[PDB]
Design a protein around this ligand. Structure first.
Ligand SMILES: CC(=O)N[C@@H]1[C@@H](O)[C@H](O[C@@H]2O[C@H](CO)[C@H](O)[C@H](O[C@H]3O[C@H](CO)[C@H](O)[C@H](O)[C@H]3NC(C)=O)[C@H]2O[C@@H]2O[C@@H](C)[C@@H](O)[C@@H](O)[C@@H]2O)[C@@H](CO)O[C@H]1O
Length: 586
């Protein structure tokens, strides 16, 4: 083992910061990114507390599809990254970089990344200590004949240099299963046997119409727990709204894949946090997002989605490290071995812990995420772990997995019901994590959670998550329901058919819209009500350390009922919010 260039784990999570090459301007002799971010400007704008946990991910996007283009662009930016001087201290502080080296099967008709040899990658690793890793993303839909052989080389050249190979992929057409050798292409399987400590595997939830969210995330978690990857994460993509044909929030009708650039703007901001919770709560530590202009920002400025949701969520996972592999293994009661492709893919979990075929969310935390590995792999390194002796390792073909009903009946015996109400809730140590799991339906949800004898009832509108921590002097609360009004994008269309026929916003038009109507002159959503009821309380609680998105919340209202020893907390907000309540139990 060569010394790793960086740590990636629960205590050192990783936020990837994508910068997409502008190929049109490249043809004009410029070195720029779509959305107007600069490498240096973006890095400088990253908050100093986040800098140790964030890496700039270069992507070749629409660079010319010919030899030399991607190399020329990448060498230019690695030079900029390497020579960076911190203006406050005057010291050279090389900016850490990940290069996107593989995507779209590296077909010469799809990407300039085709003309990046492993020899060149090796050269850049040796030249640039700030090159921390290389990234393969989104070939599920174009599974090239030598993809597994090429992934083996990427992992090996990374290991050789102490860098990470990062692969984001979704289980469309058995991609994850094939990667590990299902169809007999075993090169990457063998590479992983030697070099897994340098591999990061991530889901990529983009192809949402295929509904592989639950099954891909289950693999990512199981690969990690069984030592087939060093850590895991997910790329969470607002393009899912396009893939599934949604339009105006809560509107009826499906428009199909007809308004791409309006559609990738429409996913509620807070829903990205709901998606990211599934990574964190299950020991994942790597985060990435598309579309970058919405999820991160433009012109070296943070979008409100980034500042109010993603940034604050990432700060949370740094302050409260995700459960360790040891911890997750200890809590795991069932571990699946086999191919989800043989068992209905995402349908496997529908009405088990997901409410529908096409969703990135869960409807219960009762089983958290059941971890799995493809049938091609062995559970040897899993059983070698000391923390894994209480786990039932089960073939996916077992009768307990044969139907929806059999799955719940089997899992219910091993995972006890630990809350009430039709809402998503999961508990870690002294913390309840809660969200409303509705995607595009305006329906409130309620739950009853307990901290021993203390009862907490909550009422959540859609696109609202909360983290409730029992501390010695009371309850720490994090709430996020940030959701701006996107209706303007869908102006002039009263129904789905009409929305289909709107003029294309276009990629450049959407970037412009962000600049003109999201970065500034934002159409904020209306404040909306969250209720929290605590039963078993001695006196009216006091509120402390209240803060949140500027101008986004009314002062919380507390109504204490001495006779019933209970308080009703009414919050009216639209944003990120945190406070503590101080009280004693009765
Ligand atoms: C040949 C073909 O059409 N291939 C499709 C893939 O490109 C799709 O991958 C992503 O799908 C999105 C739609 O769900 C979208 O097209 C996205 O690209 C657009 O957005 C990104 C930033 O998010 C860039 O701005 C791209 O320039 C822009 N492209 C277009 C034409 O609008 C696709 O993601 C990109 O491409 C893939 C291959 C990876 O390289 C990603 O890292 C890129 O961001 C796929 C969806 O399942 O569908 C294929 O048919």
């Amino acid at each position: 083992e060569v010394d790793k260039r960086r740590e990636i784990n629960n205590e050192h999570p990783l936020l990837m910061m994508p910068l997409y090459a502008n190929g049109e301007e490249f043809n004009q002799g410029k070195y720029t990114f779509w959305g107007g971010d600069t490498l240096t400007g973006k890095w400088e704008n990253i908050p100093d507390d986040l800098k140790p946990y964030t890496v700039i991910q270069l992507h070749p996007d629409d660079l010319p599809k010919r030899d030399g283009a991607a190399r020329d662009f990448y060498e230019h930016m690695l030079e900029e990254a390497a020579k960076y001087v911190n203006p406050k201290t005057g010291k050279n502080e090389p900016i850490p970089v990940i290069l996107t080296v593989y995507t779209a099967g590296n077909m010469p008709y799809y990407t300039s990344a085709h003309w990046l040899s492993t020899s060149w990658i090796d050269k850049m690793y040796q030249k640039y200590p700030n090159l921390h890793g290389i990234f393969s993303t989104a070939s599920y839909w174009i599974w090239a004949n030598d993809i597994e052989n090429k992934a083996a080389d990427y992992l090996k050249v990374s290991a050789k240099n102490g860098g990470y190979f990062i692969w984001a992929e979704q289980n469309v057409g058995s991609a994850i299963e094939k990667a590990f050798g299902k169809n007999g292409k075993i090169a990457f399987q063998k590479s992983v046997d030697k070099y897994w400590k340098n591999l990061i595997f991530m889901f990529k939830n983009t192809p949402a119409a295929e509904g592989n969210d639950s099954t891909t995330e289950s693999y990512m978690k199981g690969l990690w727990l069984s030592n087939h990857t060093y850590q895991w994460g997910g790329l969470m993509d607002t393009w899912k709204w396009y893939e599934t044909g949604k339009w105006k929030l809560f509107a009826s009708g499906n428009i199909g894949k007809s308004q791409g650039d309006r559609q990738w703007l429409t996913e509620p901001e807070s829903m990205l946090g709901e998606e990211a919770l599934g990574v964190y709560l299950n020991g994942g530590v790597v985060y990435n997002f598309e579309h970058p202009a919405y999820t991160y920002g433009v012109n070296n400025k943070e979008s409100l989605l980034f500042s109010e949701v993603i940034k604050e969520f990432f700060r949370y996972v740094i302050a409260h490290p995700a459960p360790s592999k040891e911890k997750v293994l200890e809590d795991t009661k069932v571990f699946i071995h086999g191919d989800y492709s043989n068992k209905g893919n995402g349908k496997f979990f529908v009405n088990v812990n997901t409410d529908r075929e096409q969703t990135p969310l869960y409807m219960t935390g009762r089983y958290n995420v059941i971890p799995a590995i493809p049938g091609v792999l062995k559970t040897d390194k899993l059983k070698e772990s000391v923390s894994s002796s209480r786990i039932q390792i089960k073939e996916i073909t077992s009768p307990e997995f044969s139907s929806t009903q059999a799955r719940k009946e089997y899992l219910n015996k091993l995972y006890p019901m630990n809350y009430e109400g039709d809402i998503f809730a999961q508990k870690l140590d002294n913390r309840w994590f809660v969200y409303n799991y509705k995607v595009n339906e305006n329906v409130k949800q309620t739950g009853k959670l307990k901290f021993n004898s203390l009862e907490m009832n909550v009422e959540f509108e859609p696109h609202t998550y909360g983290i409730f921590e029992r501390i010695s002097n009371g309850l720490k609360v994090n709430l996020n329901n940030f959701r701006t009004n996107k209706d303007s994008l869908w102006s002039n269309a009263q129904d789905a058919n009409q929305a289909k026929k709107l003029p294309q916003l276009t990629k450049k038009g959407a970037i412009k819209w962000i600049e003109e109507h999201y970065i500034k002159d934002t159409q904020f959503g209306e404040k909306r009500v969250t209720k929290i009821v605590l039963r078993g309380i001695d006196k009216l609680p006091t509120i402390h350390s209240l803060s949140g998105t500027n101008n986004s919340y009314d002062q919380p209202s507390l109504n204490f009922d001495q006779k019933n020893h209970m308080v009703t907390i009414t919050i009216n907000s639209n944003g990120n919010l945190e406070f503590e309540l101080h009280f004693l139990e009765h």
